[PDB]
Design a protein around this nucleic acid. Structure first.
Lengths: 66, 125
RNA sequence: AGCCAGAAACCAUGCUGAUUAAACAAUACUAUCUUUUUUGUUUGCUAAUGUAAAAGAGAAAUUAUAUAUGUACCGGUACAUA
RNA sequence: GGGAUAACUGGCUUGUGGCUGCCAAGCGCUCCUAGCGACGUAGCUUUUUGAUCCUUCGAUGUCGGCUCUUCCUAUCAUUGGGACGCAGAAGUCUCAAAGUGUCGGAUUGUUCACCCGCUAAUAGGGAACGUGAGCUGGGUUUAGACCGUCGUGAGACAGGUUAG
RNA sequence: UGCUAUCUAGCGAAACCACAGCCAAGGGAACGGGCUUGGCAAAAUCAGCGGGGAAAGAAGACCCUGUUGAGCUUUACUCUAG
RNA sequence: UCUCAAACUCCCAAUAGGUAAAAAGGGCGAAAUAACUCAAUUUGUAUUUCACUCAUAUUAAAUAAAAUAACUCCAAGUGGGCCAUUUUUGGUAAGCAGAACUGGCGAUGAGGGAUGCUCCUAACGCUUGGAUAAGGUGCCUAAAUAUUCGCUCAUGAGAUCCCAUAAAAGGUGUUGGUUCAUAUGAACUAGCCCUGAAAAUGGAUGGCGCUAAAGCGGAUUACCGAUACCAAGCCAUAAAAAGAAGAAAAAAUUUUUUUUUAGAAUCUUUUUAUGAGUAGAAAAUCGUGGGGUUUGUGUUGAAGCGAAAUACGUGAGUUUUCGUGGAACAUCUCCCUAGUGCAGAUCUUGGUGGAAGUAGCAACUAUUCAAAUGAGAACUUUGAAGACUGAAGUGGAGAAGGGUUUCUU
RNA sequence: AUACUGACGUGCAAAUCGUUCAUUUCAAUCACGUUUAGGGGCGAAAGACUAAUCGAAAAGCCUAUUAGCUGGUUAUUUUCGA
RNA sequence: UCAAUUAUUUUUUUUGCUGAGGAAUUUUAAAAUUAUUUGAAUUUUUCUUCUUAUAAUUUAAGUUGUUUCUAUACAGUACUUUCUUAACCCACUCGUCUUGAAACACGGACCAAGGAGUCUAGCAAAUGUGCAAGUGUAUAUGAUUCUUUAAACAUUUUACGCA
RNA sequence: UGUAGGAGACCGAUAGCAAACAAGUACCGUGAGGGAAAGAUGAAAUAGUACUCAGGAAUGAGCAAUUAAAUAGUACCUGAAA
């Protein structure tokens, strides 16, 4: 029964009451969707680097104890 | 208007008696805050019965003080003398509603020993 | 600018009202009383008080306004004076 | 439940209606304008009809007539005039004017309309669409009933009729 | 003309009632008894009367609305007595 | 070549929009890792470890009561809005319907706009003073019958946005201009004014009034003018400081006498800022019934109630006096509990008013005189009159129904 | 119980009263007793009537039925606030 | 005569309003000013400047002083303060739903008393509290438990809920 | 539910059972049914208004009189507001 249709009125003013919130801008981002093959090689590289670090850490610690 | 006595300034003498209390006979004179719409009180039209306001509140040095210059302490037993002696220079005795004449007289005598006047001293005589 | 006559219109006149004017004038008779002076007016009552304005509550030409008033002559003319 | 929403007033507007203009091609023998006045174009008003849905639905009694008074003028007549296509008699356009007047019937539910007749002329409007604790109740419009059309039907109809 | 009304003596209610009670215009929820500005405005009453109180009444019977109904009908849906 | 387009486009704004201005990072180097990568294990890619080093010792452009920022949780109210400027669509238009941006109102006082929810000024604790704003300054009505230059007379003039009418068109009213001609004749032009310009209670520049304005158009000041603005005090809220023990004065006659002498964290001292508000949320309070607890009040009259109080509290309230009154009353010491706070509901219930000594006591023809009774007689009784019912009777009888209403005293 | 749309319309009365009018030997009127009961009766049909009750009586209960709708919804100050 | 208008400055005549505070070490320190003292300066000084040493003081470092009066009172006609009309200026029926009510919107003659977010179930977050890889002690048993006891107390090592 | 005990962080006469009481009564309804209003003098009435006067009487007043108390007199506690 005979309604009014629309208005954008006050909505912008309401938005400015708490301001328009913006990105948190993280340095790391979850990478599920990113380039297969290249990213699984990156996973192998990363695992490789971790293994390299582990080998270095274990040998150095064992050397220090002796 | 404003009522200075020494460094005791009291802002308002006239009590904030309730909106149009004589107009509707059922109304009593003690304050009640309208939750009404267009009440001519909260909707703050000048020339009506004034709202009470915290701004009218007493200065912190005075707070509850009397023109007597001593804070009133109400007394219904003789034993109440014992703190009142140490505070006599800052506090005054008022004798309570109930107090039987024999006891009341004894308290009045005690108050004189304490060197503090009773503000309702002539009562029950 | 200055004027004139001119309508069933207009305003008086006329006529009606006028405790519409909290209106008023003249006249007639009357109420222990009026008039002058002194002191008082810090069971409902039985002496008795009120002022919107004292402070020197001071002041009577007049048409005037692109001119007035006297005085002298015959509403005018002449002469003074603000 | 609803003035969140019609029918009644009021209100805004004035398309539509009504009234007043401006003009100058013609008409008016002859002659633009005595009288006219198109094709055009400007206003005013709300006695029209609308558009509307702000106001009122725990109610502003829903038409008309009768009766009764007052206001308006955009004057029909009476008073004074101006112009004329005016010889007089008339008559016609026009202005100041709202002091005064503006009727009897026939037919209607009727504003309106339409005859017949008088008149001196029988102008136009406002007042909560003047006027229902003034009246009336004929009509739209409660519940009964009738005919036509429409609806299979029950029923429906700003279709008509009688009783309330 | 009767009977009433009227006036007295006697007995003696009710509906109604925000507060009330002179206008005019304005603005305003767009028609005010109160508001703003104007007009104004002087007790108390008796008898009437119907202009107003958008007078009194009854939760608009009209209209619209409700995922409230009820009544009725059919070749609406689902049944069912017969 | 003339004129053109929302749904045409060669070109093409303002406004609005986005990215940018370095340290969890960026430079240039080395070394590592791969199952990615190329002919090619440094051929790159990307990552990792080590290096060397980029402004910030005024900050790689400003400016910032920039953390009052984030973020999580839990929830409310709301979902019918409206008004204004500017852009704007439909519709003849509309205080009409529909949009856009922003600001208002809603939810808002205050001062002006004569009045007025919205226009303008401006957002508000309580006060004192100042100086201003919007706006005014003839009087109502506070300040100028101010100054200063023009224009303006109207036999319905005109006078502050919204705002309450007004146009095309005329004018030998007056005022300036400007083009022409020969201090004159033309033609135009816009200022004021006039005509164009009619309505409904009596009638509206707000009214009175105003014309050497108190009109219209300027300018020049002064004065007046708000709860806005500045300074000051006080209150509360918000934030910030800071904090877990020692002699001052007066009176006397060196000593006597008089006053004071703070350390309780939701606390005390201090400072600055802030103070709108419906729907709504929170906290702090105040009161009522009962319970435990604590330590009191009672018949040398309490509670209760009416009237009050130089009373206290912003306030709800609290406290108290007098009068009435005659029996039970508190707890704020702490804490539990609840049939816990009223002006309103055509509230429920009870009482009561104004309306009002009014409406009214109008069917049915009529009573009078005298006497008696009694306190008292229009309407009791007795008598006399007058009248009426008028055999379908206010007459007799019976049924229903009632039930001692009968009858005497 | 036709009309005066009479009087009355806070009544004499929640339908009376006055005058007018229809009926009056039959499908007549009256009494008493009796029958038929609630989605049922009964109806010379008007949805009429069935105890001031009817397009579904009265009584009691399921029931405090249900209601997106109407009305009302109770001391104080302070803070943030659509 | 030596304007005027800017610039930096220096005064002055009357006068209005205000007085918070209260300094056991920020009413302290320096400054200022005065009387001293030493060294300099320069526009050269009877308010010339700095710093060297000493004192006082205030312009520092939020009112103090003097004189009246109340009054030589005991409540008075004064003073305090309540009530009461006045008078100037301002002031529209409250509640209510509605964007919007002083309304020609709705409810309300008046006064008194009574009169409306509760209780149970289950759940959630919050905050407190006790314990922690456990927790609760369920039904129930037990007791030298018997007005108040209808609670309180206890529970001779794989029960159950939830984790 | 009937009867008997014992209870209470229950109500305190508009509440609590409809019923503190001569209430399941009065009263209303044709009937089924519906269904109230309604407590308090004082310690003691074996203290309940004696007596007098004026009154036709009701009543009133008293120098008279009970009580601690009669604006405590049986429509008797207190006695608010309108």
């Amino acid at each position: 029964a005979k309604s009014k249709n629309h208005t954008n009125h006050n909505q912008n003013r309401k938005a400015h009451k708490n301001g328009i919130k913006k990105p948190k801008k993280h340095k790391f981002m979850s990478r599920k969707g990113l380039d297969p093959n290249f990213f699984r090689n990156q996973k192998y590289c990363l695992k490789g680097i971790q293994k390299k670090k582990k080998e270095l850490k274990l040998k150095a610690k064992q050397e220090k104890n002796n | 208007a404003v009522k200075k006595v020494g460094k005791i300034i009291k802002k308002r003498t006239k009590k904030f008696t309730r909106f149009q209390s004589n107009r509707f006979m059922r109304v009593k004179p003690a304050w009640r805050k309208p939750r009404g719409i267009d009440c001519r009180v909260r909707r703050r039209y000048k020339g009506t019965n004034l709202m009470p306001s915290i701004g009218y509140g007493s200065n912190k040095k005075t707070k509850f003080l009397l023109p007597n210059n001593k804070y009133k302490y109400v007394v219904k037993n003789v034993k109440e003398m014992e703190p009142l002696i140490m505070n006599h220079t800052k506090y005054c005795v008022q004798i309570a509603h109930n107090v039987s004449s024999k006891k009341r007289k004894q308290i009045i005598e005690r108050a004189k020993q304490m060197n503090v006047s009773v503000i309702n001293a002539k009562a029950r005589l």
